[PDB]
Design a binder for this molecule. Sequence first.
Ligand SMILES: *[C@@H]1O[C@H](CO)[C@@H](O[C@@H]2O[C@H](CO)[C@@H](O[C@@H]3O[C@H](CO[C@H]4O[C@H](CO)[C@@H](O)[C@H](O)[C@@H]4O)[C@@H](O)[C@H](O)[C@@H]3O)[C@H](O)[C@H]2NC(C)=O)[C@H](O)[C@H]1NC(C)=O
Ligand SMILES: *[C@@H]1O[C@H](CO)[C@@H](O[C@@H]2O[C@H](CO)[C@@H](O[C@@H]3O[C@H](CO[C@H]4O[C@H](CO)[C@@H](O)[C@H](O)[C@@H]4O)[C@@H](O)[C@H](O)[C@@H]3O)[C@H](O)[C@H]2NC(C)=O)[C@H](O)[C@H]1NC(C)=O
Ligand SMILES: CCCCCCCCC
Ligand SMILES: CCCCCC
Lengths: 103, 101, 157, 284, 81, 115, 115
Amino acid sequence: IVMTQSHKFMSTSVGDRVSITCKASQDVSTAVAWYQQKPGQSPKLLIYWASTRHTGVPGRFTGSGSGTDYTLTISSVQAEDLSLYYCQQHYSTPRTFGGGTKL
Amino acid sequence: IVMTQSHKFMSTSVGDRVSITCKASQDVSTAVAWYQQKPGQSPKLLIYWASTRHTGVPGRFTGSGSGTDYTLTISSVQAEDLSLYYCQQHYSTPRTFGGGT
Amino acid sequence: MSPSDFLDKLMGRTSGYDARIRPNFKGPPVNVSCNIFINSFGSIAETTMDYRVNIFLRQQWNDPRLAYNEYPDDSLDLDPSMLDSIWKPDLFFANEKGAHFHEITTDNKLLRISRNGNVLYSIRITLTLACPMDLKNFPMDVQTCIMQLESFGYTMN
Amino acid sequence: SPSDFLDKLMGRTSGYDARIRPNFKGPPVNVSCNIFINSFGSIAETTMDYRVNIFLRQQWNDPRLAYNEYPDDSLDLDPSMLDSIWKPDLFFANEKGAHFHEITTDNKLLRISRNGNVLYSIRITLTLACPMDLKNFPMDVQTCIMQLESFGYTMNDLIFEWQEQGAVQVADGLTLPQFILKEEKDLRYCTKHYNTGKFTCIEARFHLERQMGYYLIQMYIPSLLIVILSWISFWINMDAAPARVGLGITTVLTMTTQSSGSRASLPKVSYVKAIDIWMAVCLL
Amino acid sequence: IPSLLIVILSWISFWINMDAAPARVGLGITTVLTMTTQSSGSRASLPKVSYVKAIDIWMAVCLLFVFSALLEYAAVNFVSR
Amino acid sequence: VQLQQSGAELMKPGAAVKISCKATGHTISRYWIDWLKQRPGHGLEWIGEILPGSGSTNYNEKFKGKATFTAEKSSNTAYMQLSSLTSEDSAVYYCAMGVRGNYFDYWGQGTTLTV
Amino acid sequence: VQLQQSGAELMKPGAAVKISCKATGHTISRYWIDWLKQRPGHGLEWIGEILPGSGSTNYNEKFKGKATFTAEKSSNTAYMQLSSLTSEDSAVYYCAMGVRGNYFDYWGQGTTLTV
Ligand SMILES: *[C@@H]1O[C@H](CO)[C@@H](O[C@@H]2O[C@H](CO)[C@@H](O[C@@H]3O[C@H](CO[C@H]4O[C@H](CO)[C@@H](O)[C@H](O)[C@@H]4O)[C@@H](O)[C@H](O)[C@@H]3O)[C@H](O)[C@H]2NC(C)=O)[C@H](O)[C@H]1NC(C)=O
Ligand SMILES: *[C@@H]1O[C@H](CO)[C@@H](O[C@@H]2O[C@H](CO)[C@@H](O[C@@H]3O[C@H](CO[C@H]4O[C@H](CO)[C@@H](O)[C@H](O)[C@@H]4O)[C@@H](O)[C@H](O)[C@@H]3O)[C@H](O)[C@H]2NC(C)=O)[C@H](O)[C@H]1NC(C)=O
Ligand SMILES: CCCCCCCCC
Ligand SMILES: CCCCCC
């Protein structure tokens, strides 16, 4: 199974809204996670099962989508939101991530 | 569910027969309760399931009907029977009384 | 009328009797007048704080789709094998704590269907009820043991 | 449609397949479950177990049990229609023996809501296992657990979570002797990673405090009394050799039989307990 | 009855001579020793209950009267000199 | 069985009020406590229900977000709390309790609200 | 639960290195420990999983033979050994641990390997 984020980079601005896509190949499930890796530190989980949040994630992170298409979404960017965002499919044996998207 | 009593006011002398109709919008069951509330106190249960009598309701209180039509009939109407009479359907989640009488 | 042909028209094969549908469906609740007959107490243990007893739990209810106009009998005593194809109120014991039917040589079940729809259901049941006792005055105590005949799957409505 | 509804809903019509979980090849099945305990007793230190009669309830959406015929929000059903629908295959990881109740009928409850939500209540005896630390036996405070776990479905097809509010429910007059069940009950996850994958688990912690009143009578007072009369040999004359020796020779064996009696009520545990270093010192 | 008998057993020390030290000593000790076992024998099937029962305050008081006669003799030799 | 409510209440438009229902004769965590609403010009009206031991509630559609049911086993009392009071809350609020069915065979004296 | 790895590594082409993943917070034989690859220029990539108590593993097809998962309950740590290093093995290797699913909610600080 191959995940695909067709945008390595995306333009944005502080306080605005952005929609990050991750168009999988097969229709695995609604099982898609979303990670955030600040440069120099380990990634952190944000949205597992494509809609649920992890203990500690801010409220401005929202997941959606089903089948193949998915989307992460922020609402009010603070000074700690411009980093790399990885989409992970966890409905198969090879847990392949996406290409990552630098915000 | 809407419990629509026909008439709001009803008056008559002692020893009379009165039919207090309570027509519901859905044929819930024979589940209908009739409450008497004297002015200034908590209501009291008279009839439940449209036919039974609560502990302490001495005679002259008889329910009837089924489907969506009901009735609370009284024959030996004393002076202490002119008050508010509420029909209550208890065959659904949102409980609703009637329009009083 | 060849009662093999009558037991199939009252229930069982023909007439479309569903033992899953309560009598008076979407109507008044099925009131169940039930009594018990205790064969024997015994084993009233203070250690476990319980006591076993076998009883003949009799319970009667009106099932309007079991009314027959063929046999002129008042009641009609049936076979206990015709007892798994009719509705039965699912009462348990809130202090059951271990109870079992008696299968010795047959099903110890009784079923007679009156001419209007009434149903006498007698069953023989041993059950070790839980009797929480107050032993403040143990040698001279006067305990009070109970059995709660409760329904489980059907509400008060 | 008084009875064709039950056929067109599940069984004999509409092609309901009770072997395929709800929303197959989709997100998992969150099964919100809560517990109501009727009886809670028979807590034996010898066997390290306890018997707790409970009603296990659990709700899960099932999108192919949504009806548009009856206007009722919920819809009570007969428990005979409870074997023809999907059900989460949970068990108790510390079961140690558990049986249903078929007294006069299967004690099962089914309720299919208007949108597909399926309530499911069943009664279980469930003599669970409670490994208890007896380092301070007479006045200890144990924690008997209850692990609700899935067996045949990984955490990609079946997930369990407690009721958000009021998950564990105790009966009113439930007072077990020799203990007191604290009103606080810890609800935590116990997710099990086995050799075959990720498996759902959710446990309920029960905190029990041992009523010391019993052991205060049988254990401490007699041994306390046996130590007292050992002191009154000093008041008797010292020349009375056999009379004076008669006190200790019987009290030494007296405390010995008392210390042994504090074992049948307990398991054969290796370390020393709070009562053993009382009976031993009194023996000294 | 057995607890009643042992309580009356220990009373014979009050008649026998005071100088018979091993007689009255072992008697009051054996009786109090037995009531300690008789009270423990009152829990064959009784549950491990916290509060005090009605038989508990009977065996305890009979126990409380058996070694009271024991230490009573302890004062007799002590009062003797 | 008896149910003792609180006294008369007097609140201002926009505040919130918490009405009690003291149970004197049974453990509060035993039966479902129902909350009704009697306003002059209309009959009664069922607010919801709370089982004071399990924290379960069934609010009427019209009163969701308006009434908040709680309880306290330390006092055997159930609590209803109306928030965002307006001029449409002036009425009498009861706490009935149907034991053997969905009717109301037990009642409280009735608390009078004025907003 | 806090996973801990070893320091950075500097290995020559053809040698073999053993990256550890200390388990400070839970028994190592309790959860599935995972192993990920993050080579700069590309994104993350799941190597495989090991259960440190049962000796069961699940390697990715792309990393069969290259990765060798082990474990040692004597110190609560799970090891990975990269054999036959090359120039295409310069990346950061993490040891995540998903508890309630196949996601990776727990992570190590990251073992950097430059061949
Ligand atoms: C299930 O259905 C019903 C609801 O639960 C109940 O059926 C009713 O059962 C009672 C007996 O328990 C029958 O009694 C009737 O009583 C009337 C009234 O006459 C009496 O009235 C005076 C007081 O004014 C009283 O003091 C005297 O003793 C009189 O005898 C009689 O006229 C009837 O003949 C009959 O005896 C009801 O008839 C019966 N309901 C119906 C609709 O038949 C009961 O709970 C369950 N069913 C049964 C059969 O028990
Ligand atoms: C389905 O499975 C899910 C697990 O995958 C579970 O759903 C999640 O359950 C957790 C706790 O059990 C919830 O966490 C809570 O949610 C609240 C929500 O607050 C908001 O509430 C209203 C809702 O309309 C909203 O309008 C307010 O503005 C609040 O913001 C959180 O604030 C807390 O963190 C609290 O812990 C999850 O919310 C819940 N998921 C979702 C998407 O709601 C559960 O097992 C199953 N749930 C269902 C609905 O089937
Ligand atoms: C238990 C009887 C004790 C009485 C002793 C009296 C001592 C007086 C000196
Ligand atoms: C509750 C009473 C405890 C003391 C028993 C001797």
